Amino acid sequence: AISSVLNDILSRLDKVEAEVQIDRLITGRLQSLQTYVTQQLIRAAEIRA
Amino acid sequence: AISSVLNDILSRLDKVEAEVQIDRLITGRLQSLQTYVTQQLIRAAEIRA
Amino acid sequence: QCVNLRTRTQLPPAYTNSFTRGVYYPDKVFRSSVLHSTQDLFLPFFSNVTWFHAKRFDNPVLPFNDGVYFASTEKSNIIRGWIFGTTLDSKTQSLLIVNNATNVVIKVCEFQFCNDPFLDVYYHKNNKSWMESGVYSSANNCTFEYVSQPFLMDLEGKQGNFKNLREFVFKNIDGYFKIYSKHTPINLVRDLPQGFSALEPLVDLPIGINITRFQTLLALGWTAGAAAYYVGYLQPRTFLLKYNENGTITDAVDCAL
Amino acid sequence: TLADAGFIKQDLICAQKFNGLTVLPPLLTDEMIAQYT
Amino acid sequence: SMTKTSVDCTMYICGDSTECSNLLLQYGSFCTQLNRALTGIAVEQDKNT
Amino acid sequence: DPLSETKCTLKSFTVEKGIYQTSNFRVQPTESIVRFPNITNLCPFGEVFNATRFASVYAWNRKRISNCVADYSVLYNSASFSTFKCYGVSPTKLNDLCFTNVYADSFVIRGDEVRQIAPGQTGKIADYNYKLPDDFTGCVIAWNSNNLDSKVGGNYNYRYRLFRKSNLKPFERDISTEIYQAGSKPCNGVEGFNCYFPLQSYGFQPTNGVGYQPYRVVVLSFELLHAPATVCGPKKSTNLVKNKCVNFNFNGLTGTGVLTESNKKFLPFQQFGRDIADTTDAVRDPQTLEILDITPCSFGGVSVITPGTNTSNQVAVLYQGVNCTEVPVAIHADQLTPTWRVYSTGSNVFQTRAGCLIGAEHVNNSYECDIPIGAGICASYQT
Amino acid sequence: NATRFASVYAWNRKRISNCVADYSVLYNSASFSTFKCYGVSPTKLNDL
Ligand SMILES: *[C@@H]1O[C@H](CO)[C@@H](O[C@@H]2O[C@H](CO)[C@@H](O[C@H]3O[C@H](CO)[C@@H](O)[C@H](O)[C@@H]3O)[C@H](O)[C@H]2NC(C)=O)[C@H](O)[C@H]1NC(C)=O
Ligand SMILES: *[C@@H]1O[C@H](CO)[C@@H](O[C@@H]2O[C@H](CO)[C@@H](O[C@H]3O[C@H](CO)[C@@H](O)[C@H](O)[C@@H]3O)[C@H](O)[C@H]2NC(C)=O)[C@H](O)[C@H]1NC(C)=O
Ligand SMILES: *[C@@H]1O[C@H](CO)[C@@H](O[C@@H]2O[C@H](CO)[C@@H](O[C@H]3O[C@H](CO)[C@@H](O)[C@H](O)[C@@H]3O)[C@H](O)[C@H]2NC(C)=O)[C@H](O)[C@H]1NC(C)=O
Ligand SMILES: *[C@@H]1O[C@H](CO)[C@@H](O[C@@H]2O[C@H](CO)[C@@H](O[C@H]3O[C@H](CO)[C@@H](O)[C@H](O)[C@@H]3O)[C@H](O)[C@H]2NC(C)=O)[C@H](O)[C@H]1NC(C)=O
Ligand SMILES: *[C@@H]1O[C@H](CO)[C@@H](O[C@@H]2O[C@H](CO)[C@@H](O[C@H]3O[C@H](CO)[C@@H](O)[C@H](O)[C@@H]3O)[C@H](O)[C@H]2NC(C)=O)[C@H](O)[C@H]1NC(C)=O
Ligand SMILES: *[C@@H]1O[C@H](CO)[C@@H](O[C@@H]2O[C@H](CO)[C@@H](O)[C@H](O)[C@H]2NC(C)=O)[C@H](O)[C@H]1NC(C)=O
Ligand SMILES: *[C@@H]1O[C@H](CO)[C@@H](O)[C@H](O)[C@H]1NC(C)=O
Ligand SMILES: *[C@@H]1O[C@H](CO)[C@@H](O)[C@H](O)[C@H]1NC(C)=O
Ligand SMILES: *[C@@H]1O[C@H](CO)[C@@H](O)[C@H](O)[C@H]1NC(C)=O
Ligand SMILES: *[C@@H]1O[C@H](CO)[C@@H](O)[C@H](O)[C@H]1NC(C)=O
Ligand SMILES: *[C@@H]1O[C@H](CO)[C@@H](O)[C@H](O)[C@H]1NC(C)=O
């Protein structure tokens, strides 16, 4: 995306351009949570043992 | 991407078109490592047990 | 008007290991109690700066690429300013950064320079203290100009008995040119100090030119003051910077050293 | 040397919480684990 | 045990934007599925203790 | 009510005994702050766009717009701009926004070269005499000027660099007149076969076709990383509140949170402070030179505590991580993410270790756990 | 730049082979009102 800050994307671009940048932040962030929760589920199984 | 070979993309396209193809290779490859490391963390827990 | 004084030929220049000098705040962002990485052009740690000392006088022409660190351990203000350009002979533009007893003047008109140019204290001339034109001949095609007042000033320090270290960085990127600086009172006779300090930004302007060379400017069959100055060349590096609780860079790591 | 016990917010911990990352209390406080022990 | 953590998947991904939150909804139940997983870990820390 | 929000989180008309997560609360902004530098004088857009004559592309002009109020609607509301494309902002958003500096580049070209001028393009103009950065943010503006720049004999004062050894760096200009060896032989002097002068006239005459007619071009190369800003769109600043939550906008940094007087000593060169998250956490107000801490205003998990719906429709609500000095402070005389204020009844508020519990009686008698609340507390349904 | 060209019903095909191209000698011309390339950059054709 043209910036990592969600408010800047929304300040600089109108809706149909902003949606293309915001979707890159959403896609990358969502993969970042899915990674964290996977690591934490695998740690939870070790602590569980 | 128009080819699976990173050097071909860089040989055939100039920077602003190449970035759109290279990002598809990066995104797919990165998901391929995140898959491998997840499988290996789950195997590592089996071998640990 | 060239007061041509080629008394001394090119001398094999002295060298000095720059321990931890050449670090500056990378952007106008406050940060505090954090270790932050920054890919930017910096002076590599423990690197050979060239060293100079103004019968003893010193003002060579130097190459410029990627950017420069400049510093001086000095008393009474002999070091007055800088030249930058690509051809230096009016086949291309070139720029002047002059400082005096207060003001700073900036100009990028297509100057022709003498082979041995510098600016003296013009005690007599047509009158006292004339405008600092005499480095160049012609100025008919001027694409930018600037001026400021409170640029650098001396320290009181019980009449300033110690040599006060003056540190500067000069840099260009994609048509912009930028300046950073710091001062410190120090008690070393003949070498650059062990210890640490960040440089704050002072000035920026959009010259829009190629640069390949630079030179220093000094005041005054004559007598003048003696002082050292040092030159280092910046390189693309990554530094990890420790901002203290007050948000000053207190320490750094040059992660290619 | 613990970090973020989630006992009432009113720094690394403050940065984390302000991005929607909350830390929950354990059911059994350190007095109750000491009593069982 | 380990530290119980939960995440607001909307405040993490879209923090305080409505026009980002309407794009996040196009990804379906993924945010709820992450919240569930983190709750399952968090309850297990009391089960373990 | 809170029970209904559990039913739609579980997607069931009945709920088993337990504690359940529900949509987070987050206190809404009371009102909007806006702040910009208290400058007043309008920027010189007339002579930037409608001066008598403009530079040739070899020596393309640059003027620095600074220390003034723009109005890019007064531009974009004109019919006169045949092209007005912005490449890192919407042309409509330019009014809601402020910039470190603006450089207005001005020059003239044949009407077919307007395509070459867009960022990251390539072609003889774009390669040898005027190149935008590939990462450029700014606007490109162009219009036909055959009815202004096309004297009948030919406007041969307008000219382009035909040849250059290598493609120039972004935003370079070149005024040199060096002769070009298009052949292998090392030519010198002034002229010869494959030994060309570098600068050639446009053939601008008023009978020329569309695409061969003269076009005036302006490029607004504005820069908006958050250094202290000097050119803003026209918006009225307003009085600055503290300790209340607000929407804020400082110099185009739109956000939401509570402002506070800060002991964080920014040095005079700085204006914004950033958190580990790359989000701003302090700002220097552009009208009073003072540093404000920004905290995003109170939010937390909302968990609902219930016996079975097959036992009661009473529930209690846990505001996770909240000093409920803010729960009664929330009061739905204004908006919140949750609509159910019904629980803010009072005379039951219990400030627990892991947040605050509304709608459950605190008893000094102790029992075996039933529904866990955290930090040693449990809840249960009894007489 | 031949004297005449085929109609679209029987559109012509010529095989370029066994020779050195120079697509800059083409793309450095002003004469091509359209010159769009769909699987390579028109600038990269020389390195290829
Ligand atoms: C340090 O060097 C400066 C030039 O490099 C010099 O600035 C020059 O100062 C004189 C006197 O103030 C100015 O003269 C003009 O002053 C006003 C300007 O509005 C006019 O009314 C006068 O008629 C006269 O033209 C010069 O113009 C000025 N030059 C620049 C570029 O600003 C400083 O005075 C020097 N300072 C010391 C202490 O030596
Ligand atoms: C940089 O300075 C140069 C010297 O003043 C200047 O070049 C000069 O440009 C003018 C036109 O603006 C020429 O003047 C002559 O123009 C035509 C040429 O056929 C004659 O019919 C006129 O009578 C008039 O004499 C100069 O001859 C020319 N001089 C040189 C040495 O080339 C540049 O234009 C300046 N550059 C910029 C960007 O300002
Ligand atoms: C962050 O910056 C603060 C401002 O410079 C600095 O506070 C200063 O700390 C020094 C050292 O303690 C004080 O020096 C004086 O201390 C006492 C009086 O409190 C005197 O007996 C001493 O003789 C000496 O004069 C400064 O007075 C104090 N300044 C202020 C305005 O309070 C912090 O210490 C800095 N912290 C860090 C970690 O950098
Ligand atoms: C380019 O040159 C133009 C000629 O001066 C100039 O545009 C002119 O601006 C004025 C003020 O905006 C217009 O006056 C009319 O403005 C509105 C139109 O709805 C009315 O409310 C007013 O009563 C008045 O009728 C002129 O009409 C306008 N000229 C044209 C041909 O549109 C521009 O300012 C110049 N360019 C720049 C960037 O300044
Ligand atoms: C900025 O100014 C520089 C100094 O005038 C200029 O550098 C020169 O660039 C050209 C092209 O790269 C070089 O030309 C020579 O190239 C090779 C040797 O590297 C030879 O085989 C060729 O025959 C030709 O002579 C120059 O050697 C080089 N000069 C120096 C001192 O490095 C740059 O071109 C300018 N920057 C831009 C963006 O143009
Ligand atoms: C909840 O917040 C309030 C402040 O809004 C806290 O009240 C302060 O408590 C300290 C310690 O007992 C007293 O010295 C202050 O005088 C109190 N101030 C006020 C305005 O009442 C309260 O302690 C907080 N409670 C928790 C558990 O966080
Ligand atoms: C610096 O210069 C000294 C000689 O004065 C030399 O011994 C040393 O190896 C040099 N180091 C580098 C990295 O240039
Ligand atoms: C200095 O001399 C010039 C003539 O060269 C004269 O115009 C000016 O007034 C003099 N100034 C002073 C202060 O003597
Ligand atoms: C504008 O702000 C300054 C401080 O930067 C303040 O002193 C001044 O009073 C303000 N302008 C007006 C017209 O009041
Ligand atoms: C629901 O309540 C009824 C009595 O009203 C009772 O017969 C039944 O066993 C209960 N079922 C559950 C699962 O609680
Ligand atoms: C709990 O007991 C203490 C005395 O031990 C008393 O002060 C407090 O008010 C009691 N709370 C309730 C809710 O009865």
Side-chain angles (χ1 to χ4, degrees):
Chain A
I2 66 180
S3 178
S4 60
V5 181
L6 196 85
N7 304 309
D8 299 4
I9 300 300
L10 296 176
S11 301
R12 301 221 310 264
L13 299 178
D14 61 338
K15 203 176 76 79
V16 69
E17 295 296 353
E19 285 177 37
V20 178
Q21 306 305 313
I22 297 288
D23 182 55
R24 293 195 69 105
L25 298 177
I26 291 170
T27 300
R29 309 208 171 173
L30 182 57
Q31 181 182 21
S32 306
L33 285 174
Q34 285 175 0
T35 303
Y36 174 79
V37 175
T38 301
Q39 300 300 136
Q40 288 302 109
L41 280 171
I42 290 171
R43 283 190 247 282
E46 192 282 314
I47 303 302
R48 182 167 56 185
Chain B
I2 66 180
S3 178
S4 60
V5 181
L6 196 85
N7 304 309
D8 299 4
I9 300 300
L10 296 176
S11 301
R12 301 221 310 264
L13 299 178
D14 61 338
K15 203 176 76 79
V16 69
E17 295 296 353
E19 285 177 37
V20 178
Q21 306 305 313
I22 297 288
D23 182 55
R24 293 195 69 105
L25 298 177
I26 291 170
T27 300
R29 295 182 176 181
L30 182 57
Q31 181 182 21
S32 307
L33 285 174
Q34 285 175 0
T35 303
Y36 174 79
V37 175
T38 301
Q39 300 300 136
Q40 288 302 109
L41 280 171
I42 290 171
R43 283 190 247 282
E46 178 181 359
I47 297 291
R48 184 194 310 94
Chain C
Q1 68 98 11
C2 322
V3 192
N4 284 343
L5 278 169
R6 186 174 183 177
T7 301
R8 196 71 309 267
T9 59
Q10 58 297 350
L11 185 77
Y15 291 99
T16 290
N17 180 11
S18 60
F19 298 176
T20 53
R21 303 296 181 178
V23 291
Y24 63 90
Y25 299 90
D27 203 354
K28 308 311 209 68
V29 173
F30 179 91
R31 291 184 175 91
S32 161
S33 292
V34 63
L35 284 53
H36 179 252
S37 80
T38 167
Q39 201 288 333
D40 208 357
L41 284 70
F42 292 102
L43 182 69
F45 285 174
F46 300 97
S47 65
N48 276 331
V49 293
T50 311
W51 174 36
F52 301 107
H53 62 293
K55 174 59 62 178
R56 181 51 54 182
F57 79 106
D58 213 356
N59 70 321
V61 207
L62 279 88
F64 184 110
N65 62 326
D66 305 328
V68 166
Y69 166 82
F70 182 109
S72 60
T73 52
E74 202 241 60
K75 184 67 169 68
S76 83
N77 191 349
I78 304 99
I79 306 295
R80 308 295 180 85
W82 302 272
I83 305 294
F84 312 75
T86 290
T87 58
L88 301 176
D89 82 351
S90 311
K91 285 168 60 177
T92 69
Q93 308 95 296
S94 292
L95 84 92
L96 174 72
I97 309 296
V98 164
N99 317 349
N100 75 23
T102 52
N103 284 103
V104 172
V105 60
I106 302 185
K107 193 162 174 83
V108 75
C109 317
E110 191 154 43
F111 295 162
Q112 173 77 265
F113 298 122
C114 205
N115 177 229
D116 175 26
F118 49 88
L119 297 305
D120 296 324
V121 278
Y122 302 128
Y123 301 124
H124 310 296
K125 233 296 174 185
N126 300 340
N127 211 335
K128 332 300 287 175
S129 61
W130 287 83
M131 183 273 290
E132 301 90 346
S133 60
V135 70
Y136 76 83
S137 61
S138 303
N140 70 340
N141 294 345
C142 295
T143 59
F144 180 87
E145 308 265 325
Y146 173 88
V147 175
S148 185
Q149 294 177 335
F151 185 95
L152 90 173
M153 287 80 67
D154 208 346
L155 186 142
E156 294 177 350
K158 292 187 176 183
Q159 194 259 351
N161 63 338
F162 310 123
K163 297 183 185 180
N164 288 327
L165 172 62
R166 294 184 177 181
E167 308 200 57
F168 300 84
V169 165
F170 314 133
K171 181 187 180 186
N172 64 202
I173 46 170
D174 304 342
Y176 296 86
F177 180 107
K178 301 195 181 190
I179 303 179
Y180 314 75
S181 75
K182 189 61 167 81
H183 292 58
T184 303
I186 68 166
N187 301 0
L188 282 81
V189 174
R190 72 171 193 271
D191 204 1
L192 181 165
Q194 191 268 323
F196 197 101
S197 283
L199 304 147
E200 293 81 35
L202 272 67
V203 167
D204 183 344
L205 62 126
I207 55 189
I209 72 170
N210 190 357
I211 290 175
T212 304
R213 205 185 303 267
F214 94 103
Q215 184 166 26
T216 188
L217 304 169
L218 279 75
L220 190 104
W222 295 327
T223 298
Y229 83 89
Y230 309 90
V231 174
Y233 287 68
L234 309 181
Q235 301 184 8
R237 301 293 268 209
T238 299
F239 276 60
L240 179 80
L241 307 180
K242 185 173 183 175
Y243 290 82
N244 76 345
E245 178 56 12
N246 284 315
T248 65
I249 300 153
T250 186
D251 203 355
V253 175
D254 181 15
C255 9
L257 173 63
Chain D
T1 54
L2 299 178
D4 183 4
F7 280 103
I8 304 301
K9 294 292 163 290
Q10 69 201 110
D11 184 23
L12 298 177
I13 293 94
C14 300
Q16 293 155 9
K17 186 171 174 69
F18 286 14
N19 297 132
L21 312 181
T22 192
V23 166
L24 277 49
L27 172 59
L28 297 177
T29 183
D30 304 305
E31 297 91 341
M32 294 179 164
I33 304 305
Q35 283 189 254
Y36 281 128
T37 302
Chain E
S1 68
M2 68 177 188
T3 63
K4 295 183 180 179
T5 296
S6 72
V7 178
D8 177 348
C9 182
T10 300
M11 184 168 178
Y12 180 80
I13 295 180
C14 281
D16 77 38
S17 165
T18 300
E19 54 276 288
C20 184
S21 301
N22 297 150
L23 294 170
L24 181 160
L25 279 173
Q26 310 306 309
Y27 286 83
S29 59
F30 276 135
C31 276
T32 299
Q33 182 168 24
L34 294 163
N35 300 180
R36 185 178 304 179
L38 287 176
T39 304
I41 293 169
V43 170
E44 181 140 79
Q45 305 318 296
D46 293 336
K47 187 72 160 291
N48 289 165
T49 308
Chain F
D1 59 28
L3 178 62
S4 304
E5 288 191 330
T6 72
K7 288 188 182 198
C8 297
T9 304
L10 306 185
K11 304 187 200 304
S12 173
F13 275 67
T14 63
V15 180
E16 183 53 77
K17 177 171 64 73
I19 182 170
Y20 297 97
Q21 284 289 355
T22 67
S23 310
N24 297 79
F25 95 104
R26 178 168 54 269
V27 71
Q28 298 291 20
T30 57
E31 63 196 301
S32 300
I33 296 181
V34 174
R35 309 291 278 183
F36 290 104
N38 72 349
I39 64 175
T40 56
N41 51 288
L42 288 304
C43 294
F45 277 84
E47 54 263 48
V48 171
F49 281 82
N50 274 343
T52 50
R53 72 190 303 272
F54 284 162
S56 285
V57 296
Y58 77 93
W60 60 265
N61 185 40
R62 177 162 284 187
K63 181 155 179 162
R64 174 183 176 181
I65 295 171
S66 62
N67 193 13
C68 63
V69 176
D71 186 347
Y72 305 96
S73 76
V74 173
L75 278 75
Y76 185 60
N77 299 156
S78 185
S80 63
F81 302 119
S82 70
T83 264
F84 196 109
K85 260 85 78 164
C86 300
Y87 288 95
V89 291
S90 174
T92 62
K93 273 295 195 177
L94 290 171
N95 287 87
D96 290 309
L97 201 62
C98 190
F99 309 92
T100 65
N101 67 52
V102 185
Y103 299 161
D105 302 347
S106 178
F107 50 86
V108 287
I109 64 185
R110 62 188 304 180
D112 186 15
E113 288 165 2
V114 301
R115 177 185 59 179
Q116 296 196 35
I117 229 75
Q121 284 279 12
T122 179
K124 184 163 48 58
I125 297 304
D127 298 343
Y128 296 138
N129 52 61
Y130 182 76
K131 197 166 87 185
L132 297 194
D134 299 351
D135 61 38
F136 166 94
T137 175
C139 303
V140 168
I141 327 294
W143 63 99
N144 198 314
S145 296
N146 196 52
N147 76 315
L148 185 61
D149 298 333
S150 206
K151 72 189 189 184
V152 289
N155 202 26
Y156 312 106
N157 289 337
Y158 292 165
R159 50 212 293 241
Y160 62 80
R161 185 183 290 274
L162 176 67
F163 293 120
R164 194 176 193 269
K165 297 296 299 180
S166 59
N167 309 330
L168 84 182
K169 298 286 290 191
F171 300 138
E172 292 300 327
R173 70 204 299 209
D174 201 335
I175 301 103
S176 61
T177 61
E178 305 311 330
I179 307 305
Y180 181 71
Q181 48 171 299
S184 58
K185 60 184 172 65
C187 194
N188 300 291
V190 296
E191 184 49 64
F193 188 92
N194 289 333
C195 175
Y196 301 120
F197 196 79
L199 177 56
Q200 186 173 355
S201 191
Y202 290 109
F204 292 140
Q205 300 159 18
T207 196
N208 291 13
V210 183
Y212 306 163
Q213 285 152 12
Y215 273 64
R216 286 182 175 218
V217 177
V218 175
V219 188
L220 296 180
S221 175
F222 42 72
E223 210 287 280
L224 80 179
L225 87 88
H226 302 131
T230 335
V231 175
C232 304
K235 293 183 77 83
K236 312 305 292 288
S237 296
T238 188
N239 194 357
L240 184 139
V241 299
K242 300 173 183 169
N243 308 80
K244 284 163 53 178
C245 192
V246 292
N247 286 320
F248 62 73
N249 181 0
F250 293 86
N251 310 333
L253 179 84
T254 63
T256 307
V258 51
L259 278 49
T260 283
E261 176 268 318
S262 190
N263 58 3
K264 288 166 58 165
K265 289 167 289 291
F266 287 20
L267 280 299
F269 61 99
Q270 297 155 340
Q271 68 139 11
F272 286 5
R274 294 183 176 181
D275 208 353
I276 310 303
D278 190 36
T279 59
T280 48
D281 91 331
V283 65
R284 182 183 299 268
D285 178 71
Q287 305 205 333
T288 165
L289 303 183
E290 175 60 306
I291 304 307
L292 303 178
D293 179 334
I294 295 159
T295 300
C297 63
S298 56
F299 95 94
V302 177
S303 287
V304 180
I305 289 79
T306 190
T309 56
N310 200 57
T311 300
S312 192
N313 286 347
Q314 300 177 36
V315 301
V317 185
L318 176 67
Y319 292 92
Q320 294 181 305
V322 194
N323 181 312
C324 49
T325 175
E326 304 175 1
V327 173
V329 166
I331 193 73
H332 178 264
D334 72 4
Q335 294 179 1
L336 291 102
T337 294
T339 301
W340 45 265
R341 191 232 130 229
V342 287
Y343 274 93
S344 301
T345 168
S347 302
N348 62 359
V349 184
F350 174 39
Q351 179 59 179
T352 181
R353 299 295 301 273
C356 181
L357 181 70
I358 311 299
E361 181 175 15
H362 168 88
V363 301
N364 283 338
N365 193 23
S366 289
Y367 309 81
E368 181 178 1
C369 192
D370 183 11
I371 303 163
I373 281 179
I377 303 306
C378 299
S380 188
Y381 195 59
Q382 280 177 183
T383 53
Chain G
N1 274 343
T3 50
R4 72 190 303 272
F5 284 162
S7 285
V8 296
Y9 77 93
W11 60 265
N12 185 40
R13 177 162 284 187
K14 181 155 179 162
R15 172 184 176 180
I16 295 171
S17 62
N18 193 13
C19 63
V20 176
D22 186 347
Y23 305 96
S24 76
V25 173
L26 278 75
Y27 185 60
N28 299 156
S29 185
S31 63
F32 302 119
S33 70
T34 264
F35 196 109
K36 294 184 178 180
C37 300
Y38 288 95
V40 291
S41 174
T43 62
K44 273 295 195 177
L45 290 171
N46 287 87
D47 290 309
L48 201 62

